Nucleic acid binder design. Sequence first.
RNA 1: AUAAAGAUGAGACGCGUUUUAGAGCUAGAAAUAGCAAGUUAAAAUAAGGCUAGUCCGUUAUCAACUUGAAAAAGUGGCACCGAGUCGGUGCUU
DNA 2: ACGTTTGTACTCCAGCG
DNA 3: GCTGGAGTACAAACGT
DNA 4: TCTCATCTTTAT
Length: 1150
Amino acid sequence: DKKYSIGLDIGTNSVGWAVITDEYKVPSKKFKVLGNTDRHSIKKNLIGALLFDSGETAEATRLKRTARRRYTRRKNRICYLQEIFSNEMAKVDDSFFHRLEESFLVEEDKKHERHPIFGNIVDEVAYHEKYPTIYHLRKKLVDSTDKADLRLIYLALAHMIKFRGHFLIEGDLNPDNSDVDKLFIQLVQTYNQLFEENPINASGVDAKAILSARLSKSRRLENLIAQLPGEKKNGLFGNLIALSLGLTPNFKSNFDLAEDAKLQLSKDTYDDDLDNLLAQIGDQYADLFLAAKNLSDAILLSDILRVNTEITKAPLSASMIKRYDEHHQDLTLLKALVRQQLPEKYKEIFFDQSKNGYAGYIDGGASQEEFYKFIKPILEKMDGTEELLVKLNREDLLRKQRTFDNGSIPHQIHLGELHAILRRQEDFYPFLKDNREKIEKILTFRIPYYVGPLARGNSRFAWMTRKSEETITPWNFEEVVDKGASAQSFIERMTNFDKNLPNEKVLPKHSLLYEYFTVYNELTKVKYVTEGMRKPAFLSGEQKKAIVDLLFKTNRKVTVKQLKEDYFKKIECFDSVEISGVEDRFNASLGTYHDLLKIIKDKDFLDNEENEDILEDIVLTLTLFEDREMIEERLKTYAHLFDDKVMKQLKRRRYTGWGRLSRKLINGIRDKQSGKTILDFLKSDGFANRNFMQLIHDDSLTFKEDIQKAQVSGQGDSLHEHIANLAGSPAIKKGILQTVKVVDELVKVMGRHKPENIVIEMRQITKHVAQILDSRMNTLIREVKVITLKSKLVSDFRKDFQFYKVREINNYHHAHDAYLNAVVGTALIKKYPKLESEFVNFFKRPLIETNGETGEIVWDKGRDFATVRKVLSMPQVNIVKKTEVQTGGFSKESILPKRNSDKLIARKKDWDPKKYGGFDSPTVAYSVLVVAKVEKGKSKKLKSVKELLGITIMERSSFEKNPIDFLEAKGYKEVKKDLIIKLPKYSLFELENGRKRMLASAGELQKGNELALPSKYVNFLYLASHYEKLKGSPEDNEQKQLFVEQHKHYLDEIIEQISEFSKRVILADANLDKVLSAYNKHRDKPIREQAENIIHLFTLTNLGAPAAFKYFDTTIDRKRYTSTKEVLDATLIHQSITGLYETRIDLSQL
RNA sequence: AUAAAGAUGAGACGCGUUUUAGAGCUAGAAAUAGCAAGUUAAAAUAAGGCUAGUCCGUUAUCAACUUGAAAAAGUGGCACCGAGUCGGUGCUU
DNA sequence: ACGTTTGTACTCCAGCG
DNA sequence: GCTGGAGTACAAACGT
DNA sequence: TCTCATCTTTAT
């Protein structure tokens, strides 16, 4: 029944906790120990920290999952092309697809001839001679008109299908135009033809170098207009140029159209927006936009095709053939020139795969930048290498075809080459003539966003709904999938539910009902006073309705002067009118009413009451959807009510935005007696004219009980689920959840007594922590107080009062920050209970500080300082590393090549790692203690053993299905199930003399002991290493410097401390001897440098993984415990989250 | 109202890696030496799973024991003197 | 006595734009 | 980056 | 690397 308090310091990787008293004294309690060990009770202190690894975002998982989906859909694409080709393929060469399938296989494992394409050596060699790359075949099948083998058509087809490029440019792309300057001259000619008053002169302009330059497109446009004599980027020529490069121009102010009329060529909406602009001004500018489109194609195609087009129909394949030819000629010239001038470095350049020469370029792993960096100094120290250097600075020397520049290739180039192939070979094989649009669709079918993963219901990420029950193919995607419903579900599954009624969706922000609510909610607070009126008056219902029907209904924005004149003096005949409660600018305006009115040109439609639901459906359609036909499909349900032009204007309009207040909140819930909803209340409340918040906070109204009935339904959520819906990074969420369970266990330990302070430090996230812990404790006034502090408030209490924190010494500092937090929070709430709103030098002055009424233990300047120093000097602090089963991916992602090892993991089931390579370095989920008998030696005796067998993440399910069979498959016989112990990572083992080790794997350990350095040495280290510079006053920091330069024996005493603690627990002999030798070597450096590097010295000592530290110039590599045989006969400790509750298992008894 | 950042989800490219294909030639008995060539493709890209889908498979949660279908629940006196990872003393239980 | 096993110290390595 | 896996070279220890 | 949606939080 002793009053207490809890201090907490929450971090991304650590949560510290402590318990304070009113005397500010960490209590010490005896706790019972379970298990089979001799020890039964441990006195432990009520201060400690929990350490864990950081919680990870789901972005990496989303990236991996999207990659898996892309590989599955690509394999489906080759599968579809194979089903198309199969019937004739069996006629010409059966099992060709089979030979391609088993291409990744050795000859011992294949079932056909090793050559994939033709099935014999001679035609394979002849094919590789005729087409050295696949682009040679692609250019041939596009250009030639003779009949070719079906295998070659399929090969080019599947290459085009598998690497089909990007979908960033929507519309059509015509590769026939590729000259930037020719279409620039055409643009100038068309502009001068239409516009004669101010013609544009652009003769003598290097259009190719400007418009295809490598810098940004905005600066490209700026460079272009700077050269232009007397033109503006906002002008017509500048706007056309910006439209050609792709930056969106505004055509409003130039044609004076009063609508934005933005045109972007990469968007499919541009055709209909161009139709809009043609309807606005006429068709005489259509040739100008056509020439702008051609000029855009000239810019966007010359950067990648870089070849003549008048001679071929596949200019990308022509570009790759040209690149191969330049590579061949330049390689021949380079080989001859190196063999002539520098014959010694021919084996390095052309034979050595380890170096970054041409052998490293081709056979090795060297990239293009690395090879250029290697070969450029070689070319400088030679003659006749001017052209090679010219192409090297242009990044066009010895270039590969499958390079990273291929990411900018549109899918239109591959589609056009594919179309050319089908048009050339349709007359010989009729099946491509009959299946032409099928293959073109297979390339150009991309599942849209707003359509979920094409599932049936066993998916957690899917929202897509089905019209039929047929399998979704590339061709019946628009017949099985309801695209409008799926897009609505896409928007709705992420949009919010309103907080008052959690099972109901929100309306769009530009809904007219929300707009009526906002306009009326602002109008009901409108105050006005007139001459002759004693007190100013809430507006009555007819007054507010008249304002809405005149000033609001005519003007988009209504000001105070408009009210005071146009209603109050014009109609109410009051001139001396003043207002309050509102500003000059009304926050709520009825924008959607005016915009929709200007769309339709009808006023009697909207002011009717029975049609408002259909207009709500139009604003829903205009907020949800951003495909044009997918808006038009929903607008076609109301096709009868308006004109064609009206709904083209409706289709053209779009509202982005969602509100937070739903519609059954407004025209829904109603009083049990009156039967009017809150909008009907807000239309005519009476003299009271109350607004929304009180109508949801009125005790007499039944709205209050309905919304609490809505909030109670569902019972909120569980602790982890309520943690999940919060904002912020998942790591801080993990820290908060550990904090909540730490508080729960701390309350449990004390005898189920709750403390009337909980002190927290880490803004809105912290207010949410205060909310959840306040709800957990007080179960509605705050019987338990929750106080949130800041890092500055304790940093000050440490810098001013010599309570410095060297974090590199030990992990006790989280617990000590928590205890301090408790100290200062309780002292502040006792000292100033008036200033609890912001939280829920008093440290001459009285020795026992007091507020003046009940300052009993506010801050006594004696005792309390001594007690806080004793607490911060306490050797025993329960540091707990949270034991975690490691999850994630199994093994490193690198596919290492073939070698004769047992540590290579197979990439499939039939892929023997010695033959096919495989992954390596698996990750253990947890280790298990196996006590069995393994056959040893050639006499195969049942030698009983006790070993740790680490279960990797890939084998966790197989182990947990049946441990006995899995251990017997490993080789352990007569296994004893009752002694199988699940040992996760960070499991603690106490071996001898207090030496504790934490499990890292089945073959490695971590140091698990903490160095409690005497606090005098800690303060001397912090002052001497100048940690956080110097915060004391010049006299005080002068005395601190004197302290530093007079207690220099502390340096050797701390070295003795590290040496003693290392020789007791951290059994690293050589590193400790190097530590002492390097201390003796640098014993003459100034005290600051020495103490800072002694602060570095604690890495040999800190709990966790051993890591390399650096003492001045000497660095020491880590001592690692690369076998776990010692903890097999040690005391295994199971620790609670606070660690006060323990269970010790003596493993040497098993 | 504007901007930035973060979180979550979906749709897409490009590259990398791996095994195989792209008959290497001459002088020798070989070791090896000299020369020629090099730019591409197929397949896989977590093993795999059943619910067999253009699905899912690397996030969050996780001391022990007991009740357990699970979720979840239950399981362990206090005070004082001190401090090298917590120890000792007394009483109740 | 001597031939396989475990410790110890050191090195490199880790899918990305 | 961290930190756990793997290979290598070499010696001490175990076991036959 | 690319495209898109939804939300929140902070600063102005």
